[PDB]
Nucleic acid binder design. Structure first.
Ligand SMILES: [Mg+2]
Ligand SMILES: [Mg+2]
Ligand SMILES: [Mg+2]
Ligand SMILES: [Mg+2]
Ligand SMILES: [Mg+2]
Ligand SMILES: [Mg+2]
Ligand SMILES: [Mg+2]
Ligand SMILES: [Mg+2]
Ligand SMILES: [Mg+2]
Ligand SMILES: [Mg+2]
Ligand SMILES: [Mg+2]
Ligand SMILES: [Mg+2]
Ligand SMILES: [Mg+2]
Ligand SMILES: [Mg+2]
Ligand SMILES: [Mg+2]
Ligand SMILES: [Mg+2]
Ligand SMILES: [Mg+2]
Ligand SMILES: [Mg+2]
Ligand SMILES: [Mg+2]
Ligand SMILES: [Mg+2]
Ligand SMILES: [Mg+2]
Ligand SMILES: [Mg+2]
Ligand SMILES: [Mg+2]
Ligand SMILES: [Mg+2]
Ligand SMILES: [Mg+2]
Ligand SMILES: [Mg+2]
Ligand SMILES: [Mg+2]
Ligand SMILES: [Mg+2]
Ligand SMILES: [Mg+2]
Ligand SMILES: [Mg+2]
Ligand SMILES: [Mg+2]
Ligand SMILES: [Mg+2]
Ligand SMILES: [Mg+2]
Ligand SMILES: [Mg+2]
Ligand SMILES: [Mg+2]
Ligand SMILES: [Mg+2]
Ligand SMILES: [Mg+2]
Ligand SMILES: [Mg+2]
Ligand SMILES: [Mg+2]
Ligand SMILES: [Mg+2]
Ligand SMILES: [Mg+2]
Ligand SMILES: [Mg+2]
Ligand SMILES: [Mg+2]
Ligand SMILES: [Mg+2]
Ligand SMILES: [Mg+2]
Ligand SMILES: [Mg+2]
Ligand SMILES: [Mg+2]
Ligand SMILES: [Mg+2]
Ligand SMILES: [Mg+2]
Ligand SMILES: [Mg+2]
Ligand SMILES: [Mg+2]
Ligand SMILES: [Mg+2]
Ligand SMILES: [Mg+2]
Ligand SMILES: [Mg+2]
Ligand SMILES: [Mg+2]
Ligand SMILES: [Mg+2]
Ligand SMILES: [Mg+2]
Ligand SMILES: [Mg+2]
Ligand SMILES: [Mg+2]
Ligand SMILES: [Mg+2]
Ligand SMILES: [Zn+2]
Lengths: 175, 59, 142, 38, 211
RNA sequence: AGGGAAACAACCCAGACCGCCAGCUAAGGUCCCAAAGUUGUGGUUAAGUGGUAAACGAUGUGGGAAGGCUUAGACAGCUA
RNA sequence: UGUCGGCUCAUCACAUCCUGGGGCUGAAGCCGGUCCCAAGGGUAUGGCUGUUCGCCAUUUAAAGUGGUACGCGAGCUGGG
RNA sequence: CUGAAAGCAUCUAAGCGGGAAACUUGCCUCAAGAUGAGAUCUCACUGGGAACUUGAUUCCCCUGAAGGGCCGUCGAAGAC
């Protein structure tokens, strides 16, 4: 476990509270992080966050690295909000963000209304670019993947909503 | 039927059937299962005295 | 000097209450079946009902080990062609929590008129309370 | 996806993964190299 | 569902629209219904209301039923029915008329169908007959085979055989209301209603709705 | 014939003179149906494998004997 | 223990013919090919022949493959 | 999607989602002989003695209610 031997190095403006196996982080631009730990993994409290196991088990060793990743994600989220960038390709493919509803026109017979849950907020700097900001990776990624499912990229022209950092396999018609 | 009754009565005194027979045979007692089953039901005070004799035989 | 036999008229029946709140289904059920039959009494005879009364309170909190929570399957046939019907452990707890404990114990009892009489002394509920405070059951472990 | 009794790597981006007790081959380069079972 | 009225089948007729189309109609007399008992959560479990309609002689109502009809001053009637309501409020002694229905307003009608006595397999189950010629021996309308050889070796339960095209209860769903004659207590329903003339029918709002 | 292998002439144990509400064992067994260890000590399996089946395939898991690189910086990642 | 075919009446398996959900494609679209999941409901009429089968004519979303004493004569027929 | 074992990658090992005419409801009918025999409203009955094998006992006299049936006139109900 190389990752479990690396501390987190929480920045200057953060706050921690360990109620036994219960953990939370306070931060600016977002707070109220919640998580409950399996009883086989330990989080010491000091000026630095460190993790260690309790058993010599294989599964326990695997969980000692997952929790280090999860704690790292919450610390960043309450300081630098995560985001994902979506890109729309195709004629007539435009989207307008209206508060908590994102209106998408993807070549169907009716624009679709996507509801953004609490936390994440979306805004479109253009009509062919989306931005889903948030303070937790799991919710930002899941909602970005839900939007992407409406019209996944085509292999012949790239048409459809895609990730802004995605490689798309392109091929040509044999005809 | 007798074995099923000595088993139920021996566990009231804190011992299984198979451990009671080993203790009885090890020390001295040669009473039948027909009489042991009868003492278990009627004469529960004598049965306890017999069981404490089998327990005291370290078996 | 004949062997003592239990008369169905002068038997003593006590009431016990058991909490199924973290107990394995099959290891809780074997202790219930012993008490229901009377095997724990020196007066046991095979042809009379000489057991005790058992009350189970937290039926829905019984558990199974391994992957049996999903893969354990209950079948029954309705009598019409193609009438085999099935349900698993997760669904049955949601539907009828009591039918889980009742089914386990019922298969550990004899299949005859006396076996069905042993089965009528088992009361299974899903709350933390039972309606038998008059009979004053006493707590039984396992 | 190709279902065979003997699955194995076909190039240098195929990866062997065991997923819910099934051996699968996933390819990051060519989708034609996806396999199941085996 | 959840509320309705009890009526009598008066017979079928037609009405012409100004555009010239004729609509088949079943006329249903709904004598005003009287609430007999209101059932709640703390007394019965489910929620429902109990309703009586019609009128009965004093020598045909027993002392047990007369005292039930007198706890709520209702006066006895033919039959007693109960409607299972989701969330409304009624008090014992109310009146329920055809005035919970409008024109349009798809409804469901329930009644005891006409009784065929002891029907054969052709009439009851739409079996098809064997040959009427070409050598057939006294086996024209008979059912035929009812099983297989040694495998099974017993007829399967649910086999379609003859007997009693019944006077069961059947519902006809999604029937349109054409006219609601409030003063003469009539409901005009487009289409056919189960049962013969004079039988008691139950009218409830359509359960399926949509189309 | 009797006991076991669920039921099961030819398999396993064992060869019924009669009676007994006496004891010890064979094969096979000891959570409940159903007599008898929810016995003790050290490991293995996560597949209900146990409680059916091959060529072949797979970073499942335990044990053993050795090897090639490696604080002169090894193997993965990243900047030329 | 009455042996082919027809008629009446069926019931099950899934190695799926249609309808349903998907991966790959030498998949632009419309139509396709192949594999995976899926048994809820459906699944021709005639000319020839004793025919099952088969070949034809015209349809259909499709005209599935099999087990049931090659299901079914104390249910019919009797062409072979 | 998040994510380590295995600094990478990875839908899985912990955790969180989408997903079909198949499954469970939703629609229609039967259904407390569901011997586990369920629930609600209302109604009827308010006398004496004896023998004991002294209480879920038997015998006699008086008194038979709520209601049900027999009977008759029938019925779009029906083989009876
Ligand atoms: Mg294969
Ligand atoms: Mg899955
Ligand atoms: Mg009639
Ligand atoms: Mg015909
Ligand atoms: Mg003929
Ligand atoms: Mg003749
Ligand atoms: Mg004739
Ligand atoms: Mg026959
Ligand atoms: Mg049979
Ligand atoms: Mg049938
Ligand atoms: Mg034998
Ligand atoms: Mg065998
Ligand atoms: Mg035997
Ligand atoms: Mg012995
Ligand atoms: Mg031995
Ligand atoms: Mg038996
Ligand atoms: Mg035993
Ligand atoms: Mg142990
Ligand atoms: Mg198994
Ligand atoms: Mg097996
Ligand atoms: Mg036919
Ligand atoms: Mg049918
Ligand atoms: Mg079958
Ligand atoms: Mg299949
Ligand atoms: Mg198909
Ligand atoms: Mg399909
Ligand atoms: Mg398809
Ligand atoms: Mg396809
Ligand atoms: Mg099917
Ligand atoms: Mg099928
Ligand atoms: Mg089918
Ligand atoms: Mg079917
Ligand atoms: Mg099915
Ligand atoms: Mg369905
Ligand atoms: Mg034809
Ligand atoms: Mg043809
Ligand atoms: Mg011909
Ligand atoms: Mg066969
Ligand atoms: Mg065959
Ligand atoms: Mg066949
Ligand atoms: Mg045949
Ligand atoms: Mg056949
Ligand atoms: Mg014939
Ligand atoms: Mg024939
Ligand atoms: Mg004949
Ligand atoms: Mg026959
Ligand atoms: Mg005949
Ligand atoms: Mg001839
Ligand atoms: Mg002739
Ligand atoms: Mg990762
Ligand atoms: Mg990933
Ligand atoms: Mg998981
Ligand atoms: Mg879902
Ligand atoms: Mg449909
Ligand atoms: Mg009843
Ligand atoms: Mg009742
Ligand atoms: Mg009367
Ligand atoms: Mg009277
Ligand atoms: Mg009556
Ligand atoms: Mg008559
Ligand atoms: Zn590859």
């Amino acid at each position: 476990s190389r990752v479990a031997k690396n501390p987190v190095k929480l920045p200057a403006g953060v706050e921690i509270k360990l109620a036994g196996q219960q953990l939370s982080i306070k931060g600016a631009k977002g707070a109220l992080e919640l998580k409950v730990h399996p009883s086989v993994e330990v989080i010491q409290d000091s000026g630095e966050l460190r993790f260690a196991a309790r058993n010599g088990d294989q599964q326990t060793r695997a969980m000692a690295g997952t929790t280090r990743a999860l704690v790292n994600n919450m610390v960043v989220g309450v300081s630098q909000g995560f985001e994902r960038k979506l890109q729309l390709v195709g004629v007539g493919y435009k989207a307008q963000a209206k508060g908590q509803v994102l209106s998408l026109s993807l070549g169907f017979s009716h624009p679709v209304d996507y509801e953004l849950p609490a936390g994440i907020v979306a805004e479109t700097p253009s009509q062919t670019d989306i931005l889903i900001k948030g303070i937790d990776k799991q919710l930002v990624g899941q909602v970005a993947a839900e939007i992407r499912d409406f019209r996944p990229p085509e292999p012949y022209k790239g048409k459809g909503v895609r990730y802004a950092d995605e490689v798309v396999r392109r091929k040509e018609a044999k005809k | 039927l007798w074995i099923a009754r000595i088993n139920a009565g021996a566990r009231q005194n804190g011992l299984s059937y198979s451990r009671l027979i080993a203790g009885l045979k090890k020390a001295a007692i040669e009473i039948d299962r027909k009489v042991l089953a009868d003492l278990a039901v009627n004469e529960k005070a004598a049965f306890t005295a017999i069981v404490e004799k089998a327990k005291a035989s370290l078996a | 000097m004949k062997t003592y036999t239990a008369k169905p008229e002068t038997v003593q029946r006590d009431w016990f209450v058991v909490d199924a709140a973290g107990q394995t289904l099959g290891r809780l059920a074997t202790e219930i079946a012993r008490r229901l039959r009377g095997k724990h009494k020196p007066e046991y005879t095979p042809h009379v009902d000489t057991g005790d009364y058992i009350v189970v309170i937290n039926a829905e909190q019984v558990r199974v080990t391994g992957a049996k929570t999903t893969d354990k399957m209950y079948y029954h046939h309705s009598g019409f062609p193609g009438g085999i019907k099935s349900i698993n452990f997760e669904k049955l707890i949601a539907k009828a929590p009591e039918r889980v404990i009742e089914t386990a114990v019922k298969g550990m009892l004899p299949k005859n008129p006396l076996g069905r009489d042993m089965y009528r002394k088992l009361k299974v509920y899903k709350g933390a309370s039972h309606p038998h405070t008059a009979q004053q059951p006493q707590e039984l472990k396992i | 996806m190709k279902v065979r009794a003997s699955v194995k790597k076909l190039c240098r981006n195929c990866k062997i993964i065991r997923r819910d007790g099934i051996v699968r081959v996933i390819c990051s380069a060519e989708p034609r190299h996806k396999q199941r079972q085996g | 569902m959840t509320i309705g009225v009890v009526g009598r089948k008066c017979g079928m007729t037609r009405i012409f629209t100004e555009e010239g189309v004729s609509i088949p109609v079943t006329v249903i007399e709904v004598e005003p219904n009287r609430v007999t008992q209101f059932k709640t959560e703390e007394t019965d479990g489910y929620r429902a209301v109990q309703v009586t309609a019609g009128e009965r002689r004093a020598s045909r109502v027993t002392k047990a039923q007369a005292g039930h009809f007198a706890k709520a001053n209702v006066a006895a009637g033919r039959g007693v029915w109960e409607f299972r309501l989701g969330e409304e409020q009624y008090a014992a002694g109310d009146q329920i008329t055809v005035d919970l229905f409008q024109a349009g307003q798809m409804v469901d009608v329930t009644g005891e169908s006409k009784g065929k006595g002891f029907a054969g397999t052709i009439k009851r189950w739409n079996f098809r007959g064997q040959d009427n010629t070409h050598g057939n021996s006294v086996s024209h309308r008979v059912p035929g085979s009812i099983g297989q050889c040694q495998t099974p070796g017993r007829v399967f339960k649910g086999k379609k055989m003859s007997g009693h095209l019944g006077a069961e209860r059947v519902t006809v769903q999604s029937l349109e209301i054409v006219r609601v004659d409030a003063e003469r207590n009539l409901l005009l329903v487009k289409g056919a209603v189960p049962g013969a003339t004079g039988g008691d029918v139950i009218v409830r709002p359509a359960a399926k709705a949509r189309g």
